[PDB]
Symmetry: D2
Subunit: 99 residues, 4 copies
């Protein structure tokens, strides 16, 4: 349940490449989304909400209007898990849908 | 205001072009959307809810998993007003993001 | 799976008491909910919708403004299964609060 | 329309009473809600968003599972306003109905 260097070098890149970044003094990833509006931003959130419920993996996130900041870290390992990688991956399918 | 004539024949066509049929035995239009899963289905529902609530024009919709059937008629008039029209397009636009 | 009549007899009464009720041409439960406004109705849909995805069990449902008619049945067995009951239980909870 | 000294006094009370605070640093009120789960949290977020959109007054909220932080300030007039108030009150009614 803990991203080992290997895992990381294989997994991180495709997200790193899109906007995801690792944080400091905490194993977790972040990314800032900026939609056109609230309709879209909430639409996006909802879709993410559904899946997080489905997987029992929740994001630390903040929104204001059309901006949505997401932060991913798994609780047990207290760092990244495969669980962050897919949610992100997922988040991504969803985002590019709106935008 | 119970769309008149030339308008129905200005406006509707565009809607029929895209699959909007006229309802049988009611002044209404209806269309059904097929999504891949419920996740998209509901995400689509939400964007619309937000819009509906915002204009105070609420559809009649029936959902099952990944299928959403929507009916548009203005209550005030008991028929096709401009409200339906605009809602339908916003709907169309939203449809595309998921679809 | 498809409930036996012994089962139907155990789980049903409580839902029956509450307003749930068997459909005539098929093996499913029906129940029409009414709320003050859309906010509440949509708000309620959203909570079952999360739950429904959590459990991979979806309802057939219809909504107009503040009214929501929910229909449950376990497709796989082609009739009431425990899923509909579980679900139904929860739908009940959510319901009671918005009222 | 940035609330008056008289204004604040006649309004903040109740909110004040409920847990809502005024921010040092900015003309804004704040509150952190705590729920039993994400379902409720999210259901909550939803009705609110519904309203937020209705009004055209969006919140600054953060969410990490079962807790939500809300900050309200009227960008328009650089501080608290009738709006934030209103919306705030509403946030409350909705919160109550979450159990």
């Amino acid at each position: 349940h803990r991203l080992s260097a290997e895992e990381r070098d294989q997994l991180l890149p495709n997200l790193r490449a899109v906007g995801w970044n690792e944080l400091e003094g905490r194993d977790a990833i972040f990314k800032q989304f900026h939609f056109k509006d609230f309709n879209r931003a909430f639409g996006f959130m909802t879709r993410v909400a559904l899946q997080a419920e489905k997987l029992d993996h929740h994001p630390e996130w903040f929104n204001v209007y059309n901006k949505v900041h997401i932060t991913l870290s798994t609780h047990e390992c207290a760092g990244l898990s495969e669980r962050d990688i897919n949610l992100a991956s997922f988040i991504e399918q969803v985002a590019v849908s709106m935008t």
